[PDB]
Amino acid sequence: PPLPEYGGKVRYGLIPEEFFQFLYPKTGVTGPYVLGTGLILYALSKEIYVISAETFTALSVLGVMVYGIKKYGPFVADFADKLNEQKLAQLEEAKQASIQHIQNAIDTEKSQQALVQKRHYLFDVQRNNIAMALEVTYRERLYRVYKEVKNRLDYHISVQNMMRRKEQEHMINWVEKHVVQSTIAKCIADLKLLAKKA
Amino acid sequence: LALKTIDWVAFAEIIPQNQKAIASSLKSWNETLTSRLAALPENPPAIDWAYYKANVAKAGLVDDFEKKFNALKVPVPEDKYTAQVDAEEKEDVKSCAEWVSLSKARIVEYEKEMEKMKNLIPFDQMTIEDLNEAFPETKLDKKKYPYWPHQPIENL
Amino acid sequence: QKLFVDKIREYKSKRQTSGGPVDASSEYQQELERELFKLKQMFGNADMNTFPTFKFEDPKFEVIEKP
Structure with missing residues (x-):
């Protein structure tokens, strides 16, 4: 339950304004003061209030009290109000701080859920590597079998080629060396062609 | 050969610190096997027998070499x-x-x-028990400190 | 025709090689064995007159699963 804001509107710190309002309708604005004056003067004049040393003790205490409230009343009011504002501000920040802590926890949990949703890459990576290794080995095997069969066939064709080469070389130089082992007709025919040179 | 395309940072976030080495080795072998599938084509060039029919002058050896090849059962490795x-x-x-x-x-x-x-209730309409049930950190340990003020005097 | 007699008579004498594998060589094998040694050894080491039999290995694989 919230407190009200203002009190009861006393006057001179002694008499509430309800009394002045209550005597307004029947005695104007000066009714309460005329009544107070009359009662003070009646108490004095009839020795209901005996003037003594307590008159001056009371005057000094009342003066010290009025000066005290008037001078250190603003300070005390503002001190109480600032105490309340500081406790309120501290409580508000502590409330918001707990809100932020639990919101951070919620965020962290949703982040963990994002990770666990990303999990599957480890296993598709392993599957990638298995498939790729098997395919690499398959193609390497097919290249091995191809290249071996082709190498054997090309070794045959290369021995055939260089065999033909060495045989043809021996052929041509043998036939020269053997025609060297083997004609007045050409003797005359050389001069005949020299004559045909013209 | 229908592969699963992969994020690599996503792959990085989901690896516990007791198998980071294995994650990196899997990654390096992924890259190595990509490279090695790049640098070798799909199917060998089956050489025509023509250059080995019309220039191998030997008695039918090329022909059995090619029949034993057309009839070869090359082992396809299975997954396992x-x-x-x-x-x-x-x-x-x-x-x-x-x-x-x-x-x-x-x-x-x-x-x-x-x-x-x-x-929460507004703080200016809040009893002390409402605070002690909202933020239970703010409750006096009337267990350890049984006598008033129910807390260390320095705390006050 | 000196060089024409050379060419034609000598190619005919050469083609007369029924019993002659190499047309009256009487030599040229003593080095041809060295040449064929080189040629075959630089083409391969096994027997290159028979079909190659194919041994094939299979890739290794490990414990990959989450420890």
């Missing part, structure tokens, strides 16, 4: 390793979904608590 990583993926997805249901339980509890804190 993918089914078990499929089983491991199933087991892991089981663990993952159960942990997710737990985290959703915790999240609904946290959302209940944040609705609780969001609808």
Whole structure:
């Protein structure tokens, strides 16, 4: 339950304004003061209030009290109000701080859920590597079998080629060396062609 | 050869620190096997017998060399390793979904608590017991300190 | 026709090689064995007159699953 804001509107710190309002309708604005004056003067004049040393003790205490409230009343009011504002501000920040802590926890949990949703890459990576290794080995095997069969066939064709080469070389130089082992007709025919040179 | 394209940073976030080395080795072998599938074509060039029919002058050896090749049963390697990583993926997805249901339980509890804190009484209409049940950290240990002020005098 | 007699008579004498594998060589094998040694050894080491039999290995694989 919230407190009200203002009190009861006393006057001179002694008499509430309800009394002045209550005597307004029947005695104007000066009714309460005329009544107070009359009662003070009646108490004095009839020795209901005996003037003594307590008159001056009371005057000094009342003066010290009025000066005290008037001078250190603003300070005390503002001190109480600032105490309340500081406790309120501290409580508000502590409330918001707990809100932020639990919101951070919620965020962290949703982040963990994002990770666990990303999990599957480890296993598709392993599957990638298995498939790729098997395919690499398959193609390497097919290249091995191809290249071996082709190498054997090309070794045959290369021995055939260089065999033909060495045989043809021996052929041509043998036939020269053997025609060297083997004609007045050409003797005359050389001069005949020299004559045909013209 | 229909592969699963992969993020690599996503792959990085999900690797516990007791198998970072294995993650990096899997990655390096992924790159190595990509490279080695790049640098060798798909099917060998089957050489025509023509250059070995019309220039191998030997008695039918080329022809049996080519028949033994056309009739060769080259061994296609089978997986024997993918089914078990499929089983491991199933087991892991089981663990993952159960942990997710737990985290959703915790999240609904946290959302209940944040609705609780969001609808607190205004602090200027709040008894002290309302504070001690909102932020229970603010409760006097009337157990350890049984006598007034129920806290260390220095705390005051 | 000196060089024409050379060419035609000598190619005919050469083609007369029924019993002659190499047309009256009487030599040229003593080095041809060295040449064929080189040629075959630089083409391969096994027997290159028979079909190659194919041994094939299979890739290794490890414990990859989550420890």
